[PDB]
Amino acid sequence: ILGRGPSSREEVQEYFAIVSSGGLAALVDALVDSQEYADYFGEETVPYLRGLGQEAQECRNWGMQQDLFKYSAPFRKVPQFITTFASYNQPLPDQHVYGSGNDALEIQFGAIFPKATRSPSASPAPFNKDTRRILIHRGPGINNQLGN
Amino acid sequence: MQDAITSVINSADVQGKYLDGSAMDKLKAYFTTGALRVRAASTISANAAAIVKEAVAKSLLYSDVTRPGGNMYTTRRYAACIRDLDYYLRYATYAMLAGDPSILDERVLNGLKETYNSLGVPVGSTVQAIQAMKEVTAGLVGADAGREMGVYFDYICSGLS
Amino acid sequence: MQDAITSVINSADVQGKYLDGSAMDKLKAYFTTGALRVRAASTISANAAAIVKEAVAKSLLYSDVTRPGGNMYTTRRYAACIRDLDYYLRYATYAMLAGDPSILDERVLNGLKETYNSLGVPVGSTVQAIQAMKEVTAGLVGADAGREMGVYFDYICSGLS
Amino acid sequence: MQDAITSVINSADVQGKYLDGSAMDKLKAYFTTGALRVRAASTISANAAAIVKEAVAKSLLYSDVTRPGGNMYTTRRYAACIRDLDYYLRYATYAMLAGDPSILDERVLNGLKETYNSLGVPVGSTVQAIQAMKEVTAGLVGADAGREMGVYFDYICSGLS
Amino acid sequence: MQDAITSVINSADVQGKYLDGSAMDKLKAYFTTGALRVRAASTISANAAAIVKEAVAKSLLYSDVTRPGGNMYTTRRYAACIRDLDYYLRYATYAMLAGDPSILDERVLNGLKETYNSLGVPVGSTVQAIQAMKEVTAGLVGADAGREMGVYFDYICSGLS
Amino acid sequence: MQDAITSVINSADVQGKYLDGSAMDKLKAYFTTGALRVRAASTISANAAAIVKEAVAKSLLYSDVTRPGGNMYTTRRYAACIRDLDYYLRYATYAMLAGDPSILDERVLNGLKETYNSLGVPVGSTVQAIQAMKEVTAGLVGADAGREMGVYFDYICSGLS
Amino acid sequence: RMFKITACVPSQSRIRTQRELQNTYFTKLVPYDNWFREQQRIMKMGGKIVKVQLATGKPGTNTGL
Amino acid sequence: QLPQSYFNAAEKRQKFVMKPGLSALEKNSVVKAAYRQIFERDITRAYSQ
Amino acid sequence: GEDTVPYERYLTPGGYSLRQTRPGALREDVGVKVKVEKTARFIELGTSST
Amino acid sequence: TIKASGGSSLARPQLYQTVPLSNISQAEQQDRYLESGELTALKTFYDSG
Amino acid sequence: SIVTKSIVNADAEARYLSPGELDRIKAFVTSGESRLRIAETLTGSRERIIKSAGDALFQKRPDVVSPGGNAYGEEMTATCLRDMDYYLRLITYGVVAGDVTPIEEIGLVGVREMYKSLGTPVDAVAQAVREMKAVATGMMSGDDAAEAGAYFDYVIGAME
Amino acid sequence: SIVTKSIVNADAEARYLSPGELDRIKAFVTSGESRLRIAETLTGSRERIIKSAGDALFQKRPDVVSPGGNAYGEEMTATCLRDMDYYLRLITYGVVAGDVTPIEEIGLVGVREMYKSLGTPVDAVAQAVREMKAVATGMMSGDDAAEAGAYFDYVIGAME
Amino acid sequence: MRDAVTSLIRNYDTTGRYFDRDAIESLKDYFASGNDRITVAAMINSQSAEIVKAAANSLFEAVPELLLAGGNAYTTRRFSACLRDMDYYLRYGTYALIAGDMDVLNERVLQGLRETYNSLGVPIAPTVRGIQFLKDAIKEMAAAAGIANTAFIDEPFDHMTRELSEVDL
Numbered sequence A: 001i002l003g004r005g006p007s008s009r010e011e012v013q014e015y016f017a018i019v020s021s022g023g024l025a026a027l028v029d030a031l032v033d034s035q036e037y038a039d040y041f042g043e044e045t046v047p048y049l050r051g052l053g054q055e056a057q058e059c060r061n062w063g064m065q066q067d068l069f070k071y072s073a074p075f076r077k078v079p080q081f082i083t084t085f086a087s088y089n090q091p092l093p094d095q096h097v098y099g100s101g102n103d104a105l106e107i108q109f110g111a112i113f114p115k116a117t118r119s120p121s122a123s124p125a126p127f128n129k130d131t132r133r134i135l136i137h138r139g140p141g142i143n144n145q146l147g148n
Numbered sequence B, C, D, E, F: 001m002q003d004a005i006t007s008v009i010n011s012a013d014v015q016g017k018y019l020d021g022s023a024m025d026k027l028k029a030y031f032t033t034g035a036l037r038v039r040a041a042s043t044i045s046a047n048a049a050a051i052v053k054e055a056v057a058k059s060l061l062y063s064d065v066t067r068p069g070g071n072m073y074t075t076r077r078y079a080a081c082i083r084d085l086d087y088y089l090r091y092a093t094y095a096m097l098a099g100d101p102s103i104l105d106e107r108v109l110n111g112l113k114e115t116y117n118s119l120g121v122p123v124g125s126t127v128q129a130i131q132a133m134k135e136v137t138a139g140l141v142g143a144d145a146g147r148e149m150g151v152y153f154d155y156i157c158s159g160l161s
Numbered sequence G: 001r002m003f004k005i006t007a008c009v010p011s012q013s014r015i016r017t018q019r020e021l022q023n024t025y026f027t028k029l030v031p032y033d034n035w036f037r038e039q040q041r042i043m044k045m046g047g048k049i050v051k052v053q054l055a056t057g058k059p060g061t062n063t064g065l
Numbered sequence H: 001q002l003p004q005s006y007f008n009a010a011e012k013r014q015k016f017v018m019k020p021g022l023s024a025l026e027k028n029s030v031v032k033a034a035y036r037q038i039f040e041r042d043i044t045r046a047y048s049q
Numbered sequence I: 001g002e003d004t005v006p007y008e009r010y011l012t013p014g015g016y017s018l019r020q021t022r023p024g025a026l027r028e029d030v031g032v033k034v035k036v037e038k039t040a041r042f043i044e045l046g047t048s049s050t
Numbered sequence J: 001t002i003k004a005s006g007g008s009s010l011a012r013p014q015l016y017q018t019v020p021l022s023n024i025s026q027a028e029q030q031d032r033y034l035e036s037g038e039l040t041a042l043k044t045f046y047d048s049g
Numbered sequence K, L: 001s002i003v004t005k006s007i008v009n010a011d012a013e014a015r016y017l018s019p020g021e022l023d024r025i026k027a028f029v030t031s032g033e034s035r036l037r038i039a040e041t042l043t044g045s046r047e048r049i050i051k052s053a054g055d056a057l058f059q060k061r062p063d064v065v066s067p068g069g070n071a072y073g074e075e076m077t078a079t080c081l082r083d084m085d086y087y088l089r090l091i092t093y094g095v096v097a098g099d100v101t102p103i104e105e106i107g108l109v110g111v112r113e114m115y116k117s118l119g120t121p122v123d124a125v126a127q128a129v130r131e132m133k134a135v136a137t138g139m140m141s142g143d144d145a146a147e148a149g150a151y152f153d154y155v156i157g158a159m160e
Numbered sequence M: 001m002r003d004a005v006t007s008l009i010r011n012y013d014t015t016g017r018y019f020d021r022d023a024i025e026s027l028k029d030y031f032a033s034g035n036d037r038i039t040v041a042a043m044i045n046s047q048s049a050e051i052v053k054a055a056a057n058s059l060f061e062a063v064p065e066l067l068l069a070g071g072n073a074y075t076t077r078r079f080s081a082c083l084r085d086m087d088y089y090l091r092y093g094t095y096a097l098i099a100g101d102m103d104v105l106n107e108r109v110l111q112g113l114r115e116t117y118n119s120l121g122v123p124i125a126p127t128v129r130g131i132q133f134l135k136d137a138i139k140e141m142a143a144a145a146g147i148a149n150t151a152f153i154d155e156p157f158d159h160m161t162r163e164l165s166e167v168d169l
């Protein structure tokens, strides 16, 4: 409808509150009746995608707007905008230092990794080289080898 | 998104076969339980806010999460928590009516773990809140309707954990 | 993991510039505060167990969390709580000595929120425990050493919340 | 991982109370059913491979899944399918002996849905295979031992679906 | 998105150099092949639906994928398959006209593997369909125009595999 | 991980059919190109370090990325960059020998984008480095062996972008 | 229910953003439920509303929209 | 802010305007553009939806 | 140390969060408090002796 | 410290306009094949090369 | 036409006509003489085109003229030849205009809905335009036959 | 640095800083003034150090500047003096930090792999740092030359 | 966004305590140095388009390849994009100078800047050296205008180039 991704966390807060009150009907009602749709498109023009040549882009919303301006975007089943906007202010996540795909499932026979090619669920996070992950000891606990 | 009927038809169609006696028996089971599903859905639609507020009064109230520092602290966070619990009860009602939990992992459990892990939402406390919601609605609608509600409540808690 | 010196050198190196007068002034500030940092670190290394047990005696004792149902109930949970508080005091001492909180978000605050949210650990109660630990050690080492301890204690409480 | 005894003790301990009459009655119920549980576990340990091969002969044989294109096609996939069904029968025997399905969602149903969804394993066909395994073992051990086996078989099928 | 001319200009500009004799020779090669590219593009625009339906009639028809259980089974899936093949032929025509496959990995091969792997689309069957489309259009436009079409068809099949 | 032979056999097996004339023609094409693949693989194994260092001397040297602030700045980062380029050349040689790029998206392109995005590695600069490596090895082994190397180099650059 | 409105909305932002032109002075059927936010939005942009007329309403009903 | 040097050097997007004066295939192509933009794929002519 | 086969010593919080906080594996203290379960005082007072 | 990140695929904006790019992108943003006169525009760009 | 298409395509883009589009219009303006010659060739011999194409069509597809088909009887066969005359007229319009927007914008948009409402097989209409193309490209020189067969090709392609 | 190393070494051991490590940090904190004086001595006269050390190196090892060597030509000799400037800068960093973790953690880990990928003899680089050490310890007082020669010694030791 | 006041407010809010002695002393420390920040901000609002150009020419004197052939500030399109980026850095440096906290820089500048720059081919290194050419220009200009303390001027650009910084140590 607007031709761009949500560019802030307060925007996702506001429009999920609108979705929560009144479904798809009130979501489209609140999106079309903005000042944004009326300023960019008016009453005659079809909405269009606004990439990095059409207008001024923002660095905070960049890697997720790049997702949305693709055709694989209805297959990113994971909400990307709210997760990056919430996880910007928090500390680092519980993901593997390199990528978020090398976290195997902890079952008895592994080789089960969430592959990047089946579902897009990619949360890269900048880990430095001297980070240490926090692990839960399988045992009593007080012999967690960082401390005993 | 598919109920018991659409899943039976999808199995018989992916086979390419006609509806044999086992499919007829499955559909007869659903067509016997459907009136109980309807009455439990009406009774749950009666008392949405009461079931939600009794679930918070059982689990989340007077604990650390409503105190300062908790993730349910502010009024914005309290309102979003009531909204999330209303979502869980509403979609559990939908999955009870369909008789199939495909709507739950299609539309609740899809990116919910990653959303809650990005926000900092405690998953164990919300699992206990959904369990208390299940306990309250099973006290509301009876034994067997409470059980067929609790199977989808346990589905939501298992996909969340 | 970097102190004030290594962060100043990293800024001047990412610039590619030599150490100008502002970097010299920052390093002079650290080289003036370092003796106070050393003496406060010795005084905190003196009384680790006393500061931890006074923090539990101020906040967590005789409340609901040490009663049945609390997350600090069992002896295993009590020992793990004392272990966690000893970790917070030890790493706050390290960040006080370095003069930079990079070790705290590198090695304490990395997966701590998700660990505590998966275990069911109350974050507000442990934030109050760290605040009482800060109050006790600021009573121990004085005004300004207590302040330069409390800035990293507030860093740990902010990253935990 | 907890049986009926350990769950009763955990409830009475999380209460902080002593074992009252309801806990005594629950433990008396388990101590009456335990001999039947023992004899059914011996009878199931007798005929592991027979129950598994009769479950495949009832459900999965001569269907499309053993034909080319099916997920049970190759000898590697057939051997892994027999391995998975032996796992389901073994852990259902364990949950029957404990009288509590905590081992099933601790050690079978933990990452099983995501594993099967990543591999491409059909969940409905393996649910039908577990149901036929339940039908065969309930024909083996009798009515009530078959029922107390089928409650954990239905637990595995519900957590898988 | 760049043709042979824009890529030559981009190489000479990233060098910062003027257009030397090798760039002049590359542009002379493109300006000699351009009329053949134009006529082949007109001939391919003539017979879009015929080339697509002959590719399905060669590869995908009467196989298992149009039968029940196949990914080309339903009318929705058949229409989406015809749409995907029309996309491959249209973008191969564009890359033939530009003389550079930058549009193919910019706008076809970007997220196509992950889309097809998420949907469950067989990549080998669609690679065989694109190969039969290449064979049909190389029978249509001749030897050398068929070769300069088949280089971009092989580019699409290589990026898909 | 499958070559042209194993992919042809897998297609004929997923069909359930015997090897018809089109499969025989595909295998004849691979058995004609295999000697050229062998000789190009020997010539590339001759000059691994030379091709890598000429690729860095063409693209990455004397630019901003080897200067302070660049991601190729330190000796650790330089050694890891040479290590990454040696990986790209080695796996492109493997995919040239197999005649199928399945090893590239199985073992290079699997988590490479997320790794490089988490580390802060520039993807465009490493794509230009792989393109210069392709240009150097196509100057080394000739026209058609350089083309059948460059198709897998373009596969790596497309999966990286 | 629908309002057949007629309004003229100058943009006052096209000079800064340098966009191309949409023709103002429109005549459109607005649905009744979001006619509110639409009238308010036309007042936000500063445009004058020429004519408001209820088209499909049959005013004074309680059900049946 | 985006400089005009960045905007004139860009992949210029066609803006589809619905004027009531227009010729009939123009309204057809503009409605086709709206179906393509909202539904992300042209849902008519590929499903007759 | 050359006498024992390895064994799984550490979990990630993702894997522990997967296995333990599932509903059958769950305890009931784990995340919020539980109140005490006494009987009603009017039932206790209505008995036949202290 | 920045604590999170989005997936940065490299994006190449068009640095300038040439003729075959212009016609291919025009026919593309309308989702159709190149029509006959577009091909004539390309053809007389090629003969004038 | 070509000028309409170039003007509209520059018009949505909020720009003037690019010089490549301008030499496109210039080349079409120069080739208009050969377009008018092809149009006179198609116009002057319309009787023989319609007659021979109807003859070859009913030879090729005899079921539509057999009892049971659409074009059975005197007036139905006359209406069939009239529909073929309509399509040859639109072919002449598309030959002059240099583009298929006359043909598409007049007689190809709802052609499936119209011929489904009339009960007409559209493949037999495609065969009618195929026989018209055979007679018409049998009537001209080589490049003239190619330029007319482009528009005949578009009509048969827009049928199916 | 010293504080980083002491903090990490107490950090793995799950203990606080021992008092011996604390007076180590205290002695380094007091000797920081002499460290900064050595750093200003090394920083202010970098031109003469790099120039004279390059002169003595190419006098000592003339084959690397002869045709056939790595540093042959104008820009190659300029890059050679730039690499020597890099190593003198890392020497200054290690002098200030009181430990060799800046030098090792920046420019000594993959030095063998990098200079093997460039085609460089590493012994001639060790001779370059040897001549830099000769010019630098010829520039200072006795204990200052010993304290700077410790880090120069570490660089030449980490080469071979 | 957060200034220093809302930083102290969020710091005291998460524990649920009122302001003590030290919170009032830190609020007095922000309110006492407030006028100094505001005349520095007004003096920057005097010569913003001059300071950005001067820092740009000093950066291009530092790294000369970017004006030359293979550099990233090559054409006038790239030159104008680089100067607009330096205008952004000075603008949000002024905003963080007035706010006294680095949360505006973190939320609106530094979050995901490295992603855009690594993707587009924009280098991160001369960006940082240009940011602190801006910092040095602002610092000497405001030290010339009678202002004694320059630590608050030192704050935001040092933060912005500790964040875009590559940690190699």
Ligand SMILES: *[C@H](C)[C@H]1/C(=C/c2[nH]c(/C=C3N=C(/C=C4\NC(=O)C(CC)=C4C)C(C)=C\3CCC(=O)O)c(CCC(=O)O)c2C)NC(=O)[C@@H]1C
Binding pocket: A052, A053, A055, A056, A057, A058, A059, A060, H002, H006, J013, M066, M071, M072, M073, M074, M077, M078, M079, M081, M082, M083, M085, M086, M088, M108, M109, M113, M116, M120, M122, M123, M125, M126, M127, M130
């Ligand atoms: C200039 C001194 C340096 C430089 C700059 C450069 N940048 C670009 C392109 C973009 N820069 C941005 C930057 C921002 N967007 C933001 O929202 C913020 C925070 C307020 C910043 C810092 C963005 C989004 C772009 C993309 C263009 C757009 O705005 O849509 C270029 C152009 C790159 C190209 O080739 O196209 C340049 C040249 N480059 C240098 O060399 C200097 C180090």
Ligand SMILES: CCC1=C(C)/C(=C/C2=NC(=C\c3[nH]c(/C=C4\NC(=O)[C@H](C)[C@H]4CC)c(C)c3CCC(=O)O)/C(CCC(=O)O)=C2C)NC1=O
Binding pocket: A134, A135, A136, A137, A140, A141, A142, A144, A146, C065, C070, C071, C072, C076, C077, C078, C080, C081, C082, C084, C085, C087, C088, C107, C108, C109, C112, C115, C119, C121, C122, C125, C126, C129
């Ligand atoms: C060095 C950085 C670092 C930290 C901080 C860390 C914490 C950490 N604390 C843990 C547990 C714990 N932490 C607590 C602490 C608390 N619960 C409460 O109720 C109180 C409010 C609070 C103490 C003040 C308790 C009770 C457990 C045990 C949970 C359990 O056994 O179920 C665990 C679970 C595994 C184990 O006990 O050994 C980890 C990994 N790990 C690390 O690597």
Ligand SMILES: CCC1=C(C)/C(=C/C2=NC(=C\c3[nH]c(/C=C4\NC(=O)[C@H](C)[C@H]4CC)c(C)c3CCC(=O)O)/C(CCC(=O)O)=C2C)NC1=O
Binding pocket: A107, A108, A109, A110, D065, D070, D071, D072, D076, D077, D078, D080, D081, D082, D084, D085, D087, D088, D107, D108, D109, D112, D115, D119, D121, D122, D125, D126, D129
């Ligand atoms: C103890 C708890 C536990 C379970 C249950 C478990 C299952 C499990 N089943 C697997 C595979 C499998 N499971 C099946 C089973 C089936 N597919 C079908 O078509 C049938 C419907 C169904 C059998 C009834 C098959 C065919 C595979 C092999 C998949 C492959 O090789 O591609 C794998 C993949 C790795 C490997 O084979 O060794 C795991 C981890 N792991 C565990 O730790």
Ligand SMILES: CCC1=C(C)/C(=C/C2=NC(=C\c3[nH]c(/C=C4\NC(=O)[C@H](C)[C@H]4CC)c(C)c3CCC(=O)O)/C(CCC(=O)O)=C2C)NC1=O
Binding pocket: E060, E061, E062, E063, E066, E067, E073, E074, E075
């Ligand atoms: C369940 C929804 C569904 C439908 C409808 C479907 C149709 C379907 N019909 C086909 C062929 C066909 N279908 C027909 C049918 C007819 N031709 C006539 O003249 C009659 C009017 C009419 C039937 C009474 C014919 C002749 C073919 C062969 C076409 C050919 O060989 O070119 C094929 C290709 C070969 C194959 O894989 O079967 C498909 C996929 N597939 C589906 O999944």
Ligand SMILES: CCC1=C(C)/C(=C/C2=NC(=C\c3[nH]c(/C=C4\NC(=O)[C@H](C)[C@H]4CC)c(C)c3CCC(=O)O)/C(CCC(=O)O)=C2C)NC1=O
Binding pocket: A071, A072, E065, E070, E071, E072, E076, E077, E078, E080, E081, E082, E084, E085, E087, E088, E107, E108, E109, E112, E115, E119, E121, E122, E125, E126, E129, H041
């Ligand atoms: C322009 C670049 C581009 C391409 C290529 C593209 C493909 C694409 N193909 C899709 C589906 C599809 N693609 C196929 C195609 C096939 N499946 C088979 O069995 C055959 C082997 C093969 C056809 C030869 C099918 C059947 C679907 C539908 C999947 C479904 O509805 O479940 C979808 C799913 C969404 C939708 O249908 O509309 C996308 C996005 N999108 C793009 O933007």
Ligand SMILES: CCC1=C(C)/C(=C/C2=NC(=C\c3[nH]c(/C=C4\NC(=O)[C@H](C)[C@H]4CC)c(C)c3CCC(=O)O)/C(CCC(=O)O)=C2C)NC1=O
Binding pocket: A098, F060, F065, F070, F071, F072, F073, F076, F077, F078, F080, F081, F082, F084, F085, F087, F107, F108, F112, F115, F119, F121, F122, F125, F126, F129
């Ligand atoms: C076999 C498949 C495979 C690949 C490819 C792979 C890459 C990979 N490259 C890495 C780092 C790296 N990769 C580069 C490479 C580059 N940066 C640049 O500026 C250049 C443009 C580019 C080289 C051409 C650099 C500099 C690092 C080090 C980052 C750092 O130390 O901060 C890392 C970080 C951990 C480590 O260095 O050892 C991984 C895992 N891992 C794999 O398993």
Ligand SMILES: CCC1=C(C)/C(=C/C2=NC(=C\c3[nH]c(/C=C4\NC(=O)[C@H](C)[C@H]4CC)c(C)c3CCC(=O)O)/C(CCC(=O)O)=C2C)NC1=O
Binding pocket: K064, K069, K070, K071, K072, K076, K077, K079, K080, K081, K083, K084, K086, K087, K090, K106, K107, K118, K120, K121, K124, K125, K128
């Ligand atoms: C210029 C664009 C245009 C077209 C195409 C057009 C067609 C058109 N064809 C008609 C009838 C017809 N057209 C046909 C034609 C055919 N049936 C066959 O079997 C043959 C395959 C084929 C011709 C070769 C027939 C048989 C009818 C009579 C249908 C009836 O009487 O029910 C009619 C209804 C009667 C009338 O008013 O003429 C219209 C409007 N009108 C137009 O304005």
Ligand SMILES: CCC1=C(C)/C(=C/C2=NC(=C\c3[nH]c(/C=C4\NC(=O)[C@H](C)[C@H]4CC)c(C)c3CCC(=O)O)/C(CCC(=O)O)=C2C)NC1=O
Binding pocket: F061, F062, F063, F066, F067, F073, F074, F075, F078, L064, L069, L070, L071, L072, L076, L077, L079, L080, L081, L083, L084, L086, L087, L090, L106, L107, L118, L120, L121, L124, L125, L128
């Ligand atoms: C701070 C740690 C650090 C070091 C050491 C470093 C070295 C380094 N030395 C290089 C080249 C070089 N370095 C030398 C140096 C020498 N050859 C000789 O014969 C002499 C023995 C010796 C110097 C006295 C030469 C000749 C080259 C050019 C190699 C070539 O052009 O192939 C290059 C490639 C071009 C460039 O981007 O500068 C790097 C990255 N980079 C670093 O970040």
Ligand SMILES: CCC1=C(C)/C(=C/C2=NC(=C\c3[nH]c(/C=C4\NC(=O)[C@H](C)[C@H]4CC)c(C)c3CCC(=O)O)/C(CCC(=O)O)=C2C)NC1=O
Binding pocket: M057, M067, M074, M075, M076, M077, M079
């Ligand atoms: C491809 C077309 C094109 C051109 C020409 C271009 C020019 C250009 N000339 C510049 C500066 C300059 N140009 C000149 C000189 C002159 N300028 C002239 O056109 C006269 C021939 C000459 C004076 C007689 C001077 C003296 C500067 C430095 C300006 C400054 O100090 O900012 C700059 C600023 C960066 C720099 O210092 O080089 C650009 C981008 N950009 C382009 O994209």
